[PDB]
């Protein structure tokens, strides 16, 4: 199918809340080798974030249920097998996304916006892997997440103003990585706080096109800070 | 053994993985034994959530289609997508209906579950009617009507107006009168009758079923207020 019609069906599927079809469309567009506009990248992110999200939440529910006490080794075996199945699906999704990133998106992007967006995305899905990983696999997944995040962070700090939405969201997710993956709440708090302070510092000079997004993101930074100060 | 299957069905429910849930309950149903009340609720929840996404998706895509200029070159993609969704919906409803006619209704032993299953038959035949055309639409609407009517009579004869199942049957059957038959007065009269008769004998209702009956009744007068506009 032509790229234009693939986009048309990605948007239609999004309207229909059918995110598997949306993600399949955008995966096709990406594999065609063509660089994606901001719009098209956001279609990719929405699609795959929705596909994986259900698995993440299911895994959380099932894990929590697994910690319940007074449960039969038999029932516990069933719970663990189900959590393992969800885990498998999640790993497959994140794998597909990362193959798209390394093979097409990251590779063919010299543009700082796109480079940061794709490196951030990589850190995100490697983080999703890291939250369900075992043993040495775990250390590798963490190191990869952290690495991609770090590269995105540097590129942003050298190329993008503090008010830019991708720099801010990148800071957000990187700090959540510090808090939940590395269990270093201090460095997460300083990361988010530095992002927010640098943003408010230059808020009066921010253009009125990206104001709507960066304000929301900033409010998320502050939310996580307050939550992380119990 | 339905035990392990039920365990997994509940896990899936709490995890909102309704495909897995519908698989579990389909297998249980096909074991051939009559379903308990929790198990009937599990079946209904599962397949309700499976078909729901396709009902909503279909509604959206159809709305877009009927608000798109007919000469538009991009119309046939919308059409093809709506037809795919509609195909999935048909598949699912057909599965449910086969489960009911072949297993559940044939072996239902008490009036409560018989009314439950007949109501379900009417519900999913109605889901088909929402997207059917021509003679197909005529006969599917007819089947829905018939299921609802049988369940309705049995409920009148064998249950109290406060029973959550009877109330729900009145709710969905009224909605059938409104959305399918297009007689708002009769739908309003079904809803109001069920609600008034329920409040009349609200004191003969189980404390545990109280939340459910209350819920349904609120849906009934919500519908009544809506339709009266």
């Amino acid at each position: 199918m032509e790229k234009t019609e693939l986009i048309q069906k990605a948007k239609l599927a999004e309207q229909a809340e059918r995110y598997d079809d949306m993600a399949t469309c955008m995966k096709a567009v990406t594999e065609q080798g063509a660089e994606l506009s901001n719009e098209e990248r956001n279609l990719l992110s929405v699609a795959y974030k929705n596909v994986v999200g259900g698995r993440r939440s299911a895994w959380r529910v099932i894990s929590s249920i697994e910690q319940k006490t007074d449960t039969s080794d038999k029932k516990l075996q069933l719970i663990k097998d189900y959590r393992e199945k969800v885990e498998s699906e999640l790993r497959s999704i994140c794998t597909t996304v990362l193959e798209l990133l390394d093979k097409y998106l990251i590779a063919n992007a010299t543009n700082p916006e796109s480079k940061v967006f794709y490196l951030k995305m990589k850190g995100d899905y490697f983080r999703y892997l890291a939250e369900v990983a075992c043993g040495d696999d775990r250390k590798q997944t963490i190191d990869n997440s952290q690495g991609a995040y770090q590269e995105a962070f540097d590129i942003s700090k050298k190329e993008m103003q503090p008010t830019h939405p991708i720099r801010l969201g990148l800071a957000l997710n990187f700090s959540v990585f510090y808090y939940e993956i590395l269990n270093n709440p201090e460095l997460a708090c300083t990361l988010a706080k530095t992002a927010f302070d640098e943003a408010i510092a230059e808020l009066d000079t921010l253009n009125e096109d990206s104001y709507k997004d960066s304000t929301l993101i900033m409010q998320l930074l502050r939310d996580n800070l307050t939550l992380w100060t119990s | 053994e339905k035990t392990e299957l039920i365990q997994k069905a509940k896990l899936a429910e709490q995890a909102e993985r309704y495909d897995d849930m519908a698989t579990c309950m389909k297998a249980v149903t096909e074991q051939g034994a009559e379903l308990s009340n929790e198990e009937r609720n599990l079946l209904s929840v599962a397949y309700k959530n499976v078909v729901g996404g396709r009902r909503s998706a279909w509604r959206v895509i159809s709305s877009i289609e009927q608000k798109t200029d007919t000469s538009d070159k991009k119309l046939q993609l919308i059409k093809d997508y709506r037809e795919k969704v509609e195909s999935e919906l048909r598949s699912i409803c057909t599965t449910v209906l086969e489960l009911l006619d072949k297993y559940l209704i044939a072996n239902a032993t008490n009036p409560e579950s018989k009314v439950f299953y007949l109501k379900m038959k009417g519900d999913y035949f109605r889901y088909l009617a929402e997207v059917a055309c021509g003679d197909d639409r005529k006969q599917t609407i007819d089947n829905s009507q018939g299921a609802y009517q049988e369940a309705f009579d049995i409920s009148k004869k064998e249950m109290q107006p406060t029973h959550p199942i009877r109330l729900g049957l009145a709710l969905n059957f009224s909605v059938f009168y409104y959305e399918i038959l297009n007689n708002p007065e009769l739908a309003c009269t079904l809803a109001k009758t069920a609600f008034d008769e329920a409040i009349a004998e609200l004191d003969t209702l189980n404390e545990d079923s109280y939340k459910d009956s209350t819920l349904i009744m609120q849906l009934l007068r919500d519908n009544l207020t809506l339709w009266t506009s």
Binding site: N173, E180, I217, L220, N224, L227, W228 | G53, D123
Partner: peptide, 17 residues
């Protein structure tokens, strides 16, 4: 609107859709 019918369908905040 659509009529109602019987059977119906802490963490950290990361960047959303």
């Amino acid at each position: 609107s659509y009529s109602n019918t019987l059977p119906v369908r802490p963490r950290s905040s990361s960047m959303a859709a």
